[PDB]
């Protein structure tokens, strides 16, 4: 019964790709929403709690008829389209707050109702809660941000395209969220709301584009929602022979002209990881205040 | 305080490698035993329970002096050497039973005692509990077992060398454990104890070594601890043009001569995954009995 049913269900909606990360052919599910997730995302999902997400294996696990009925009632496109048609919806939600949301609680109930063969009413929940926060890691392309993100070893790197041209790489651990994108525009503001820290990555060896990076950092610091954000500058690629030193970059970026902002420049090499943890400890400590 | 201390501690013991999988430079720990684990293993470890394993990030997390004192008291080689000097020790333990063990409960307590600056007495625990079981996946080298193991998408593939020459690849989900090694000898018996199912993978296109595979399968079926194990034969690489059909392999292996044993031959292609789930469903259903 199970196999025939699951094989039939994955052919429907956008069930052939992971609901969270887009990874092809997910062999895991969250019965709770009838959604299909990859093995990596299934791990993140187990952490949410059995009440919030009931994770099962498509390969081998104990199945109940109600659980298969829930899979039929749910769906990847269904949950996506439902969430998108909600007041409380945030496309910048971290996994933790996406599942703590009222829009999630409603679909949980719709899935439960339709699996029981009941008619469901949208007309007939207090979400739980420093608090949920973002660490924005931006700079020009080729600065070494993906390298830094990977080196952190804090989790799975999730690529998202919320809009055309806009490529977002994101990592999550508990309430901390590291968001990465290239600079050099209105959807960015949504990410700024929770931003407590701004990491500006500069290629210390790219002498040509140093003024472009300075223009972009100033454009960022001019943002109203970023006012109280702590700034960490990673003067990266210090390993290179003709690279500018941290004292040179501090000048070329005009960091000493900044007032009413905790800032710190850190000379790093992202490929070796030298300076990455020292720069991060500073930020982590500033964020503790 | 935290950083200086952790940097100092990883230089000690075999802390530069993951305690479970051997992956280089682990950026996660289990404070509970003062052990260093990779991000993938940290996920498996979180699942064990906060009482059994308290998982923290070396990159960024909330640290207490006692937690750092626990890291000092514990260690990768310390926990390994302690476990190895115990009566209840099993090198074939699944993560779940390794941490449910009395030898684990004792080291938890030694770590707690020494971190508190107390003297510890080895002289001064009921482990919890179908039950814990193994699915043995063997065959000749190049049969396509690593391919099958990976395709299952049931978890992290963990390579272990319990003895010289003996290479073991293992995957775990809840109580089910998939153990893989090449055939073609006395440490094998330890793995047989929990074995409920035996998967014999044969390269359907290797006409030269088909009799070698038959000799090895019969050698296996002659094992006393494997008597009641259900046998699934994967006649793999059926995609190849000059491959032998399942009816040909059933004969060449002498499967119809077998009595008092549930057996099933499944024609598969591991690279595409065709037949892998159908063959597994049969086993999973037989194991339900
Ligand atoms: N020499 C050197 N190369 C680096 C460093 N960091 C990144 N790279 C290289 O810079 C390029 C851009 O890295 P990437 O992380 O993809 O930059 P991103 O576009 O900001 O994400 C890749 O070739 C990197 O390996 C570094 O610290 N030193
Ligand atoms: N054509 C084909 N090649 C396969 C199949 N399964 C495995 N292979 C290839 O067989 C070789 C051995 O695979 P591997 O899983 O490492 O075999 P193992 O030594 O039993 O672990 C690799 O080149 C595989 O990609 C299959 O079903 N069809
Ligand atoms: Zn995923
Ligand atoms: Zn590991």
Question: Would you list the DSSP string of B200-262?
Answer: EEEETT-SSSHHHHHHHHHHHHT-GGGTT-EEEEEEE-TTSTTPPPHHHHHHHHTGGG--SS-
**Per-window interface: A 3-22 vs B, CB < 8 A:** 3
Classify residue A84 by burial, with Cβ atoms within 10 Å: 0-12, 13-18, 19+: exposed
Q: A74 and A37 in contact (C-beta within 8 Å)?
A: no
Of B145, B147, B167, B233, the residue with max ligand 2 atoms within 8 A of its CB, to mutate for a pocket test, comes to B147
Q: A26 and A37 in contact (C-beta within 8 Å)?
A: yes
CA A97, distance to chain mean position in Å, is 11
Q: B144 and B201 in contact (C-beta within 8 Å)?
A: yes
DSSP symbols for chain A: -HHHHHHHHHHSTTTTB-TTT--BS--EEEGGGTEEE-HHHHHHHHHH-TTT--EEESSS----HHHHHHHHH--HHHHHHHHHT-TT--TT--HHHHHHSHHHHHHHHHHHHHHTT----S---------SEEEEEEESTTSSHHHHHHHT-SS--EEEEEETTEEEEEEEETTEEEEEEE----SHHHHHTTEEEEEEEEETT-SSSHHHHHHHHHHHHT-GGGTT-EEEEEEE-TTSTTPPPHHHHHHHHTGGG--SS-EEEEE-BTTTTBTHHHHHHHHHHHHT-
CA of B273 to the centre of ligand 2 (A): 11
For chain B, where are the alpha helices, taking DSSP H only? 2-11, 39-48, 65-73, 76-84, 95-100, 102-115, 145-151, 188-192, 210-221, 246-253, 276-287
Q: B287 and B197 in contact (C-beta within 8 Å)?
A: yes
DSSP state, residue B65: H
Q: Which ligand is nearest to the CA of B267?
A: 2
Classify residue A198 by burial, with Cβ atoms within 10 Å: 0-12, 13-18, 19+: buried
Separation CA A194–CA A94 (nearest Å): 11
For tokens 């956008």, name the residue: A14
Pocket-forming residues, ligand 2, beta carbon under 6 Å? B 139, 141-147, 182, 236-237, 239-240, 269-271
Q: A177 and A195 in contact (C-beta within 8 Å)?
A: no
Q: A258 and A220 in contact (C-beta within 8 Å)?
A: no
CA trace torsion A21, A25, A30, A33 (10° rounding): 80
Atom 8 in ligand 1: residue holding the nearest Cα: A144
Q: If DSSP codes are grouped into helix, strand and coil, which group holds residue B73?
A: helix
Torsion sign, CA atoms A192, A194, A196, A202: negative
CA trace torsion A80, A82, A85, A87 (10° rounding): -100
The region that residue B152 occupies, defined by phi over 0 for left and psi between -120 and 50 for alpha, beta otherwise, is: alpha
The two tokens of residue B11 are 């230089």
Neighbours of B186 (CB within 10 A): 6
B79: Cα within 13 Å, side-chain hemisphere: 31
Which residues lie across from A56 on neighbouring strands?
A29
Separation CA B103–CA B83 (nearest Å): 6
Q: Is B50 at the interface with chain A, CB within 8 A? A: no
Q: A154 and A178 in contact (C-beta within 8 Å)?
A: yes
Q: A230-236 and B176-182 as β-strands: parallel, antiparallel, unpaired?
A: unpaired
Q: A226 and A194 in contact (C-beta within 8 Å)?
A: no
Å resolution of this model? Answer: 2.8
Q: B166-173 and B176-182 as β-strands: parallel, antiparallel, unpaired?
A: antiparallel
Q: B68 and B1 in contact (C-beta within 8 Å)?
A: yes
Q: If DSSP codes are grouped into helix, strand and coil, which group holds residue B75?
A: coil
Classify residue B137 by burial, with Cβ atoms within 10 Å: 0-12, 13-18, 19+: buried
CA B62, distance to chain mean position in Å, is 32
Separation CA B267–CA A8 (nearest Å): 22
Of B266, B154, B248, B145, the C-alpha closest to B201 is: B145
Q: Which helix (H) or strand (E) holds B135?
A: strand B133-139
Q: A2 and A68 in contact (C-beta within 8 Å)?
A: yes
Of B280, B206, B198, the C-alpha closest to B236 is: B206
Which residues lie across from B178 on neighbouring strands?
B135, B171
The two tokens of residue A130 are 């420093």
Separation CA B79–CA B82 (nearest Å): 5
Q: Please tell me the experimental approach by which this structure was elucidated.
A: X-ray
CATH numbers and ranges of domains, chain B: 1-113 (1.10.220.150), 114-289 (3.40.50.300)
Of B44, B46, B81, the C-alpha closest to B61 is: B46
DSSP state, residue B12: S
Q: A176-182 and A133-139 as β-strands: parallel, antiparallel, unpaired?
A: parallel
Chain A contact probe: residue of B43, B172, B280 with most A CBs at under 10 A:
B43
Q: In what order do the strands lie in the sheet containing B28-30?
A: B35-37, B28-30, B55-57
Give ion ligand 4 contacts, CB < 5 A: B 18, 20-21, 23, 38, 41
The two tokens of residue A87 are 């007041």
Of B157, B233, B269, B270, the residue with max ligand 2 atoms within 8 A of its CB, to mutate for a pocket test, comes to B270
CA trace torsion A119, A122, A127, A131 (10° rounding): 130
Residues 6+ apart with CB under 8 A from A214: A252, A253, A254
Of A27, A118, A17, A117, the C-alpha closest to A65 is: A117
Tell me if B153 and A3 make a contact (CB, 8 A cut-off).
no
Question: Which residue among A57, A60, A176 places its CB closest to the CB of B60?
Answer: A176
Q: If DSSP codes are grouped into helix, strand and coil, which group holds residue B199?
A: strand
Question: Which residue among B39, B154, B281 places its CB closest to the CB of A153?
Answer: B39
Separation CA B71–CA B11 (nearest Å): 12
């Amino acid at each position: 019964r199970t196999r025939k049913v699951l094989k039939e269900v994955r052919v429907q909606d956008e069930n052939n790709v992971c609901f969270e990360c887009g990874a092809f052919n997910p062999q895991w599910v969250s019965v709770t929403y009838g959604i299909w997730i990859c093995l990596e995302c299934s791990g993140r999902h187990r952490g949410l709690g059995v009440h919030l997400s009931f994770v099962r294996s498509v390969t081998m696990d104990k199945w109940k008829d109600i659980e298969l009925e829930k899979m039929k009632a749910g769906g990847n496109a269904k949950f996506r389209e439902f969430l998108e048609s909600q007041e409380d919806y945030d496309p910048c939600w971290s996994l933790q707050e996406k599942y703590n949301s009222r829009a999630a609680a409603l679909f949980r109930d719709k899935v439960v109702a339709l699996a029981e063969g009941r008619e469901w009413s949208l007309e007939s929940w207090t979400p739980p809660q420093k608090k949920e926060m973002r660490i924005l890691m931006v700079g020009l392309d080729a600065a070494g941000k993906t390298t830094i993100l990977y080196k952190l070893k804090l989790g799975e790197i999730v690529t998202t395209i919320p809009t055309i041209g806009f490529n977002v790489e994101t990592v999550e651990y508990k309430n901390i969220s590291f968001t990465v994108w290239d600079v050099g525009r209105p959807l960015w503001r949504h990410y700024f709301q929770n931003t407590q820290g701004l990491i500006f990555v500069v290629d210390s060896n790219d002498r040509e584009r140093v003024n472009e990076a300075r223009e972009e950092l100033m454009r960022m610091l001019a943002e109203d929602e970023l006012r109280d954000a702590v700034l960490l500058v990673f003067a990266n690629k210090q390993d290179l022979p003709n690279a500018m030193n941290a004292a040179e970059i501090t000048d070329k970026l005009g960091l000493h002209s900044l007032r009413h902002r905790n800032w710190y420049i850190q000379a790093t090499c992202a490929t070796s990881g030298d300076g990455l943890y020292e720069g991060l400890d500073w930020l982590s400590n500033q964020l503790r205040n």
